[PDB]
Amino acid sequence: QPYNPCKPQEVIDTKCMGPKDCLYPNPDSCTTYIQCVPLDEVGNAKPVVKPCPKGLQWNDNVGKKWCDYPNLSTCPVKT
Amino acid sequence: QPYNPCKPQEVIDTKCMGPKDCLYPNPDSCTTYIQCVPLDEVGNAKPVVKPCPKGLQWNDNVGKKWCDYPNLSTCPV
Ligand SMILES: CC(=O)N[C@@H]1[C@@H](O)[C@H](O[C@@H]2O[C@H](CO)[C@@H](O[C@@H]3O[C@H](CO)[C@@H](O[C@@H]4O[C@H](CO)[C@@H](O[C@@H]5O[C@H](CO)[C@@H](O[C@@H]6O[C@H](CO)[C@@H](O)[C@H](O)[C@H]6NC(C)=O)[C@H](O)[C@H]5NC(C)=O)[C@H](O)[C@H]4NC(C)=O)[C@H](O)[C@H]3NC(C)=O)[C@H](O)[C@H]2NC(C)=O)[C@@H](CO)O[C@H]1O
Ligand SMILES: CC(=O)N[C@@H]1[C@@H](O)[C@H](O[C@@H]2O[C@H](CO)[C@@H](O[C@@H]3O[C@H](CO)[C@@H](O[C@@H]4O[C@H](CO)[C@@H](O[C@@H]5O[C@H](CO)[C@@H](O[C@@H]6O[C@H](CO)[C@@H](O)[C@H](O)[C@H]6NC(C)=O)[C@H](O)[C@H]5NC(C)=O)[C@H](O)[C@H]4NC(C)=O)[C@H](O)[C@H]3NC(C)=O)[C@H](O)[C@H]2NC(C)=O)[C@@H](CO)O[C@H]1O
Ligand SMILES: [Cl-]
Ligand SMILES: [Cl-]
């Protein structure tokens, strides 16, 4: 019913435990991200909207998966 | 008995959620720090050693609590 980008294999493999695990862009906003909370053993998860600190924007790049300065973020709104 | 700098009142008041919360120096190493992971909802946490990026050292100063250039860090050495 709600938007839910939590990929099951990512949920099963990482258990969303590590510092970059199960973190996804929020389509509505560049200053938040979505973090998945596992609900069971088969990869289902509850998506949770999480805030970036003041001034920062989600950086979805491989190896990043963190809030970053806007000029380094993956916000689709640029220039 | 093993070393645990995680103070329960800080775990309780912050839930170790914020960007500077429940972060402590690692006495054994200037290139790592200790982060507290809560084990319950009533203040108990375990200490996890976390790495600084290569070449950086822990800065325990007030308002910092982050990995920093060596000349800015609080390393006792
Ligand atoms: C009892 C029990 O076990 N219960 C289980 C429970 O634990 C499980 O829940 C999971 O718990 C774990 C453990 O608490 C949670 O793990 C945490 O996850 C968050 C992310 O969600 C991690 O947060 C990241 O933290 C890293 C640092 O460790 C941050 O890295 C920093 O990023 C900044 C930029 O944002 C970098 O900044 C740059 O720095 C350079 C200089 O170095 C500077 O030049 C630049 O200017 C600067 N850029 C900017 C913009 O300032 C910085 O370098 C870097 N720091 C370092 C040291 O590299 C990163 O930003 C954080 N990311 C986000 C997002 O916040 C956190 O580390 C991690 N904790 C631990 C202890 O590892 C996990 O989230 C949680 N999962 C869930 C789903 O809740 C649950 C579920 O599995 O099960 C219970 O049973
Ligand atoms: C589903 C759910 O709810 N799960 C819960 C789970 O989320 C909870 O876990 C907690 O999650 C949160 C995120 O949600 C984690 O929060 C993160 O915490 C980390 C620290 O642990 C924060 O990391 C810092 O990030 C900032 C960027 O925002 C970094 O700041 C930069 O630091 C550099 C120095 O390293 C600064 O550069 C220096 O600047 C000075 C001054 O100008 C200059 O003099 C120096 O030369 C310069 N030095 C260098 C080397 O460049 C830079 O200015 C600054 N940037 C800015 C913009 O201020 C900082 O380095 C990072 N620190 C460390 C350490 O990595 C991170 O920001 C924060 N994320 C967010 C989104 O807030 C939290 O860690 C995690 N807790 C735990 C215990 O895992 C859990 C538990 O509560 O519960 C679940 O239920
Ligand atoms: Cl935004
Ligand atoms: Cl903001």
Numbering used by the authors:
A (entry chain A): 35 to 113
B (entry chain B): 35 to 111
Sentences from the paper on this structure:
One of the better understood effectors is CfAvr4, a 135-residue effector protein from the tomato pathogen Cladosporium fulvum, which utilizes a carbohydrate-binding module of family 14 (CBM14) to bind chitin present in fungal cell walls and protect it from hydrolysis by plant-derived chitinases during infection. The majority of Avr4 homologs share a similar cysteine-spacing pattern and contain a distinctive CBM14 domain in their structure, indicating that members of the Avr4 effector family have a conserved role in binding and protecting chitin in fungal cell walls against chitinases. CBM14s are short modules of approximately 70 residues that bind explicitly to chitin, a long-chain polymer of β(1–4) linked N-acetylglucosamine (GlcNAc). Here we present the crystal structure in complex with chitohexaose of CfAvr4, a CBM14 lectin and the founding member of a fungal effector family that binds and protects chitin in fungal cell-walls from chitinases.
CfAvr4 bound in a 1:1 stoichiometric ratio with the (GlcNAc)6 ligand and the final structure of the CfAvr4-(GlcNAc)6 complex was solved at 1.95Å resolution, with R-factor and R-free values of 16.7% and 21.4%, respectively. The X-ray crystal structure of the CfAvr4 monomer spans residues Gln35-Thr113 and is composed of an N-terminal α-helix (H1), a distorted β-sandwich fold formed by a central β-sheet (A) with three anti-parallel β-strands (A1, A2, and A3), a small β-sheet (B) of two anti-parallel β-strands (B4 and B5), and a short C-terminal α-helix (H2). The structure clearly shows four disulfide bonds that match the previously determined disulfide pairs of Cys40-Cys70, Cys50-Cys56, Cys64-Cys109, and Cys86-Cys101. CfAvr4 was crystallized with (GlcNAc)6 as an asymmetric unit consisting of two CfAvr4 dimers, with each dimer respectively binding to two (GlcNAc)6 molecules. Each dimer consists of two CfAvr4 monomers bound to two parallel (GlcNAc)6 molecules stacked on top of each other. The dimeric assembly creates a 2-fold screw-like rotation of each monomer, such that both sugar and protein are rotated 180° and translated by one sugar unit to create a molecular sandwich that almost entirely encapsulates the parallel-stacked (GlcNAc)6 molecules within its structure. Surprisingly, the CfAvr4 dimer interface is completely mediated by carbohydrate interactions and no intermolecular protein-protein interactions are observed across the dimer, suggesting that dimerization is a consequence of ligand binding. Contrary to previous assessments, the chitin hexasaccharide is accommodated in a shallow trench across the longitudinal axis of CfAvr4 with the face of the pyranose rings binding to the protein by means of nonpolar and CH-π interactions, and the ring substituents pointing into the protein core and forming hydrogen bonds with both the main chain and side chains. The main facial interaction between CfAvr4 and (GlcNAc)6 is a CH-π bond between Trp100 and GlcNAc-5.
